[PDB]
């Protein structure tokens, strides 16, 4: 609902179908460098902009101050305002974010690939969630 | 006495930054602490100047921060204690997301330096 | 100074990858795919050279960064960069914030212009810290 | 007054001591300890004319200042300086802030700003009282 809302919901589905287009099919994704590297770029904005939700809602409601990325999204669960199984694939979206951005650990790919397969659906349930409230 | 003198500094403010955008009064409200966002960063000097004009008018001492130019540990003070004199809401939520997202990526950033100073 | 070495090869490695995807910049400004690979490494330089900075500063006991910026003006308040080389290393901190967090819509054109003539920066970074 | 002349003439001392560690301005904002000595020698200004300033208002029963930033008005307010030169020695008030606290990069454009332009202000002010 809110201006803040609507923009990041906005930038989250307009990234969702940047990574779908990229990642064709995976024909030459496992072989493009290129494309790997605009996936995770995407899906970096994506992260990025549920983080952002994650910490408009908790100031905004004063369920406290995260310390980090990963506790805005526990706050949200244990105010039940985000399913806890949600809220645990969201944390691990992190995970893979810092992983591909600043490597302190070498990138598995097949994370990436499965990611874009399965993996899309939490955040399109989360702009849900957040779109009722 | 406390109204009296926020309006007072959110005249002063108005009148000689263009582009005013958010007007915030941290640290302890003597000596007042006072932080503000414009649509361009304030020059060093000229900032200095209308902190002493502000520490003139109030007979305090004045710290008057720009926000973007301001540390991110120091824009993370702000949106924590804090009080929005003047500004709208959209550009205050703008300005939270933007701090604390940032902080909290510097928290992972520095966390290595912060263990090895704390013991 | 074992991550360092690591760091540095990550930086030529995405200097490369940077150079390899813009070519010649014809089809840059119309190719959406082409602009995120290049900002996506020119962040992964950023933060590596970040990285670089804080761990020099804990090996040396610098100070306690206040911010991402902060990191490489403590590197030149110890004159152990040149002062020259902060501010434009900082200003690519600049550049790299936009990019993660979406508080300004990012200038494509100055993307264009750092690929031209801003990548020396991180060549010349690699090499004053491969000295010391 | 002997404590009037030694006010005075710790002013004068501290102006020729910035004068000089400052020299041509070329290594000051490189040397720590030559913005140290300059920042503590302008402490010493503000506090020396603030005793004057304090010094006055008592002895002539200009009235009791609640603040630092007072004692000048109160000069002003009775015609003894113009307005004018008391706005910049209250703009000297918030000065001694800049010592306490070592942020360096943030107030160095400041105090570089003081010695060049501001200077003259603490001359005025003491040959002011010498007049009298
Ligand atoms: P940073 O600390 O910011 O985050 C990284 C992550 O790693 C942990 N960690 C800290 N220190 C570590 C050391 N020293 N070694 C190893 N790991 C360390 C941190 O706790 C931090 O959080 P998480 O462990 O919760 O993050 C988990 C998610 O990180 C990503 N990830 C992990 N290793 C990766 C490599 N090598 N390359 C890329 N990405 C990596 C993943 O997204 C991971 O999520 P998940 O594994 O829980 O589930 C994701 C999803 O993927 C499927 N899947 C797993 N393994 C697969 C293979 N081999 N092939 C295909 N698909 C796979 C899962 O089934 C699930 O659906
Ligand atoms: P973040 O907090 O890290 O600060 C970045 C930037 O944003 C301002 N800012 C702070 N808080 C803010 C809030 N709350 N809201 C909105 N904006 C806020 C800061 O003041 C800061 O601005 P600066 O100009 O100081 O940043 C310096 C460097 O930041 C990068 N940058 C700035 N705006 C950008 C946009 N829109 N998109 C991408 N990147 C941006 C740049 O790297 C910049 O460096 P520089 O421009 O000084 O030097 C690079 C080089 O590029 C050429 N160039 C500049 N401008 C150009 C245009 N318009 N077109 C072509 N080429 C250009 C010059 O040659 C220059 O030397």
Redesign the pocket.
């Known amino acids: 609902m809110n201006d803040i809302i609507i923009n990041k919901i906005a930038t989250i589905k307009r990234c969702i179908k940047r990574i779908q287009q990229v990642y064709g099919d995976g024909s030459q994704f496992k072989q493009d460098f290129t494309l790997q590297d605009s996936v995770i770029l995407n899906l970096q904005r994506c992260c990025e902009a549920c983080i952002d939700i994650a910490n408009h809602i908790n100031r905004q409601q004063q369920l406290g101050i995260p310390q980090s990325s990963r506790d805005s999204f526990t706050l949200l669960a244990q105010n039940n305002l985000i399913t806890q199984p949600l809220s645990d694939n969201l ?6 974010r ?3 951005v600043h490597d ?5 790919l ?6 874009v397969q ?2 899309l659906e939490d955040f399109e349930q989360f702009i849900d969630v957040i779109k009722a409230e | 006495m406390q109204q009296l003198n926020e309006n007072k500094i959110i005249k002063l403010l108005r009148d000689n930054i263009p582009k005013l955008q958010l007007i915030y009064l941290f640290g302890s409200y003597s000596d007042i602490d006072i932080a503000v966002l414009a649509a361009d960063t304030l020059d060093n000097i000229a900032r200095w100047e209308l902190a002493q004009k502000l520490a003139s008018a109030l007979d305090s001492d004045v710290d008057l921060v720009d926000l973007r130019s301001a540390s991110t540990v120091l824009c993370q003070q702000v949106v924590t204690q804090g009080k929005q004199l003047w500004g709208t809401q959209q550009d205050d939520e703008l300005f939270a997301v933007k701090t604390i997202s940032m902080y909290q990526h510097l928290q ?1 950033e520095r966390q290595a330096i912060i263990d090895d100073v704390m013991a």
């Open positions: 944390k691990k979206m992190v995970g893979l810092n992983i591909a302190y650990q070498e990138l598995n097949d994370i990436v690939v499965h990611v399965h993996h | 992972a």
